[PDB]
Design a binder for these strands. Structure first.
Ligand SMILES: Nc1ncnc2c1ncn2[C@@H]1O[C@H](COP(=O)(O)OP(=O)(O)O)[C@@H](O)[C@H]1O
Ligand SMILES: Nc1ncnc2c1ncn2[C@@H]1O[C@H](COP(=O)(O)OP(=O)(O)O)[C@@H](O)[C@H]1O
Ligand SMILES: [Zn+2]
Ligand SMILES: [Zn+2]
Lengths: 640, 640
RNA sequence: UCCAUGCGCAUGACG
RNA sequence: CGUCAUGCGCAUGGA
RNA sequence: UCCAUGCGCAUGACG
RNA sequence: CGUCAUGCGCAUGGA
């Protein structure tokens, strides 16, 4: 494995066992350097005939699979054992065993941490930093806060300090391993000065326990050889603002602020809690609606108002279906006022929606772009709904197709925000096509920003965040931060080893003590662990829904209430297991059909608390907040 | 942008580049004139194709936001770049950059000055008056003393004199900009004659470097067209005076003056220092109590004595809680004497408080007022406690409500005087309501006097400071001063340019030299910078509390003492982070829970000094007084 | 290969 | 500390 | 949007 | 120079 020159020197310290960081710009292929380090380290331990383990960590799974596909296996296919361990890829054999085998490991963070947790737990599954003789890391910039990498290294620190004490006062000290670290750039956070930046860097180094930053300040020429702009372009709104003010009047709601910002939203949520802490109507009820309206506003500000019509079409049609289901098996004053207030305008509002708008301006921009140019394309933005809107709206346009441009959307995987997620599989499909050329232009939130191999693209437009385009000042501040961190890197590199040691020791101790304080407060957190002290109520209608003991649990995750005395209440709904809804139409939960039972599960977001102590109403958004505990279900009971 | 006639001529000189002042009465809308000047100036620099910058300054933030909302943007929305820069409104991009962009600037004083300070500092953030080709100012009357406006212009002067010297003895001289200035009225201070007034005016002109005052002495008719009275209305006191004299007897305290004035208070404070310089009891202890009593007196003189009962209820109940906490985890001779001296009367004193009083007289006045009259209302006064008292007392009255009058209070924002402050947000809420009509009558200290848009109000009552009412001679003197400044304006306008120049040059030099003397003395001020030379003692009990080196710092603002040897002392209290209190009940500070630590912060007001040199006790009210310096905290230590 | 659930984390904007 | 948006990782269960 | 802290400034009354 | 009251501005930190 021949090593490029600029890679040679930067690696050189690590071959002496110095636990250093190694930062190199993208495109330099810092992986093959890592292989050189690992292979050399293994050969050194081979010469010593001792336990040579490397446990490489990447935060994302795709990185791990890529490393197992392309870089580590092909180079070390011959000599050593490898395994592309990950959470998703089922591995019949547990981790302690692969620690006893498979000298080399690709892996992913919280798998290792889970195993270490099991060591600290009574699972009897064990692993220690002791067992490894080396660790290798990627994207060290993540190692700042309560991140997984940081949690992994924090345990190692405490052991180091114990070992330092043991050295002075004891013959034996526990072994600890080397720690490499690779990053595209160390990063700088919350810096408006060089000094805060340097402190950040030192924090990172302490977290990694490293001896020094390392860069290539010598062979910059070959690097520049191999490694190689900001362009910037109604009555419907008012029609809706008028209704919002009408509803404030209907509600006596004082915003204290304007329409079309997060501040209005936050006040709406706070009023929603208070009205939930009141069990009143037109107060929480109307906060919910106004949240929808404000979202309609701020998407409208950036999006075709047709999409706001779509948003509220979805919303209000679901409202009709909820009330219609409620009718099956009446309507309140509030709901009638609001719903009719909408429907009286809905049709004309759509007529307004037809009328010509960042989107139109942008089209004028990007169509002009697609004449210059193999065609490649990228887009960024913030929301997942914006991506779909851009995709559909662009599809509707005849000009974009006429140019031959084909476009597809792209978002993450997580199950939040009320959007249809994208699977890992389908992401791979899309990027493979963007390499095939089926789609010329991607639409992405931040997935494409990193990890995914998107490259060779002329245009990278950012809408509201190698030609560069930035539609909508933020580039300037980023440039300033880049300059600031380069200067700080140089400063730290040129520092006294003694002062450097003193500085990092102090930061290490600070981190450890802060964790200990965290643990003290955390242990103090949960104290009650009560079986039944409460009542769950519908939050629109401050109505009794459940008690505390009638509840039960499954999977030690989900909470459901049998005892069909409860079942006499709710209503069921579904369109396209099924969904539960209130006698007032308030959404309650899902009919989880599992374990041979149609368990009526619910979600604590939508309910409100009343302690037996008569303590004030509370809203949590998650069960785990309260420390009280509910029983696990006994199928012998309810067996029937 | 068409310009009104009386505005036309007054502006005319400035279009020639003369750096003049422009004073116009309120209601003339002098902003649109400023726009005309700026736009014309920009168009002139456009014709020259040179750097056209305007940096408008207002002392208050609200003025800036108003200018960005209403006047500059709408008129110049099209051509030029604008930015409503302020301290509160977070601006991701720093100031030097907005100096490199955003041709037009609204701003606020000390932001600019901070940037200029950074230029003089090593921050590397830079800006100069050079960069700007124009400055615009509002409320120039502020530019008298060490005000921000004055500090800003003082730097410019020195550079001007250097440039004057450079002109005679050098080809190149540094560029300097025009300086406009707008004010409602120039103002006159400490004048009992025309001559002192004229000197004041000249001082203002020199500070602004202006060429001339400008007024409209020609188009007064249209002005008067667009621009358009003094009415004036017990045993409880004695009950308390008797106790005060009883306590003098208990203390051998000789006032040398009477009860119910600042003089008694000031002597009380001086005795408090001396008794702190004695470490004695019944001397500082009783000065504190008598300060409370005298405040009770002078509020009582103007306020319902129920509120004095409230004041001392608060005080003595807190005394009980302090001593009760002290008991947890005894009582002195002094405290028992004083407390029982109070409690023996407290109930009957309240009974007296029920008995009918400026307030009652005033009610008889203002109720009569509210029959004449859309209803609008204003009130002025001095204290913040008076506003609350008026609001609650008026609320309790049935007549004021019966008339339909609704009333709300209003005060500033600052965190001083032991009152609940009012946020900017809530001030906007109130004035918006006073425009809506929810509240008919405001109660205000001086906030309403200016800046805030309060208008169209028939009544403006002043209680102890377009019908005018003045409840309680001061109007006469104000009228005299107004006449005196109008005459002086006319005099200065009609003056020789040569003599005018000579006069202002001399004043400019005087100001500069005075600043240089200030800087010399200031540099001479701090000289010691010692780590630990002292001991901090409780001031009631002359007891050791801290040393000098055991102290540490955070934020380079706050001082806390870890080393729980200290922690063995104090006691904690809270009612409704938390508060620290003495083993004798003397208040010490706050348990600042920050950075993952429950740091026990303290306040130097409440402690007393003892140098290692054995120098006499000292009280400072602020840490910064002493030049000695304490270390910044090292979290590595105390990490645990 | 898809679906549902729970948990933890970071980033950005805001208050 | 709270809100929103975004992305990520882990652990359950099912088709 | 709220909270706590530090700093500087001006005004008025007084001594 | 000191005291009180009032108002303002800036800079930190947190929820
Ligand atoms: N010793 C070497 N000599 C020549 N090229 C190398 C060497 N090591 C790595 N490379 C180049 O680096 C590239 C791999 O970069 P990669 O690791 O994908 O980038 P990143 O560091 O962003 O993951 C390869 O295309 C390869 O040509
Ligand atoms: N050229 C003009 N013609 C007519 N009216 C004008 C002109 N310029 C300003 N105004 C009036 O001045 C008013 C603005 O005054 P404003 O600037 O708020 O007062 P202040 O000077 O106290 O801030 C506006 O209501 C407007 O009618
Ligand atoms: Zn309900
Ligand atoms: Zn004490």
């Amino acid at each position: 494995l021949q090593l490029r020159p600029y890679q040679m020197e930067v690696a050189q310290p690590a071959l002496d066992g110095k636990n250093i960081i190694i930062c190199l710009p993208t495109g330099s292929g810092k992986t093959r350097v890592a292989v050189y380090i690992t292979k050399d380290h293994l050969d050194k331990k081979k010469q010593a005939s001792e336990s040579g383990k490397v446990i490489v960590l990447v935060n994302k799974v795709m990185l791990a699979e890529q490393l197992f596909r392309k870089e580590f296996n092909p180079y070390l296919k011959k000599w050593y054992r490898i395994i592309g361990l990950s959470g998703d890829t089922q591995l019949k054999i547990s981790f302690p065993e692969v620690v006893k085998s498979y000298d080399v490991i690709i892996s992913t963070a919280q798998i290792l941490e889970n195993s270490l947790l099991n060591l600290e737990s009574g699972d009897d599954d064990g692993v220690q930093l002791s067992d490894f003789s080396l660790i290798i890391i990627d994207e060290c910039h993540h190692t700042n806060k309560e991140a997984v990498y940081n949690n992994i290294m924090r345990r190692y620190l405490k052991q180091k300090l114990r070992n330092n004490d043991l050295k002075k006062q004891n013959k034996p000290a526990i072994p600890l391993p080397q720690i490499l670290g690779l990053t595209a750039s160390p990063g700088v956070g919350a810096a408006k000065k060089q000094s805060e930046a340097e402190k950040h860097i030192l924090n990172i180094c302490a977290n990694l326990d490293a001896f020094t930053i390392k860069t290539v300040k010598e062979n910059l020429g070959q690097l520049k050889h191999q490694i190689k702009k900001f362009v910037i372009a109604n009555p419907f709104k008012e029609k809706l603002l008028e209704i919002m003010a009408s509803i404030q009047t209907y509600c006596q709601k004082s915003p204290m602020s304007d329409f079309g910002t997060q501040h209005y939203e936050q006040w709406a949520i706070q009023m929603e809690k208070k009205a939930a802490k009141d069990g009143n109507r037109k107060d929480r009820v109307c906060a919910e609606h106004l949240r929808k309206y404000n979202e309609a506003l701020q998407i409208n500000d950036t999006i075709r108002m047709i999409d706001a019509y779509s948003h509220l079409e979805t919303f209000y049609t679901d409202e009709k279906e909820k009330k219609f289901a409620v009718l099956n098996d009446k309507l309140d004053e509030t709901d009638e006022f609001l719903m009719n207030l909408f429907f009286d305008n809905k049709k004309m509002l759509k007529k307004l929606a037809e009328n010509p708008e960042k989107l139109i301006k942008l089209r004028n921009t990007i169509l002009e772009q697609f004449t210059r140019s193999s065609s490649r394309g990228i887009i960024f933005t913030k929301t997942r709904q914006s991506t779909y809107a851009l995709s559909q709206w662009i599809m509707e346009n005849a000009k974009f197709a006429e140019v031959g441009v084909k476009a597809h959307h792209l978002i993450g995987a997580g199950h939040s925000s009320e959007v249809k997620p994208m699977t890992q599989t389908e992401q791979k499909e899309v990027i493979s096509k963007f390499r095939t050329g089926e789609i010329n232009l991607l639409i992405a939130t931040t997935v494409a920003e990193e990890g995914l191999d998107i490259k060779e693209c002329n245009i990278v437009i950012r809408y509201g965040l190698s030609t560069y385009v930035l539609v909508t000042e933020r580039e300037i501040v980023n440039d300033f931060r880049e300059k600031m961190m380069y200067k700080a890197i140089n400063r730290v590199q040129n520092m006294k080893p003694e002062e450097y040691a003193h500085k990092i020791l102090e930061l290490q101790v600070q981190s450890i003590l802060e964790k200990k304080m965290k643990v003290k407060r955390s242990i103090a957190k949960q104290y009650n662990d009560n079986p039944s002290l409460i009542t769950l109520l519908c939050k629109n209608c401050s109505m009794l829904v459940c008690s505390g003991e009638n509840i039960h649990v499954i999977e030690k995750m989900h909470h459901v209430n049998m005892t069909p005395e409860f079942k006499g209440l709710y209503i069921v709904r579904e369109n396209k297991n099924g969904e539960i809804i209130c006698k007032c139409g308030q959404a309650w939960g899902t009919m989880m059909v599992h374990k041979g039972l149609d368990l009526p599960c619910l979600k604590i977001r939508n309910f409100v608390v009343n302690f037996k102590n008569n303590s004030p109403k509370k809203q949590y958004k998650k069960w785990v907040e309260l420390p009280i505990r509910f029983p696990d279900l006994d199928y012998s009971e309810y067996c029937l």
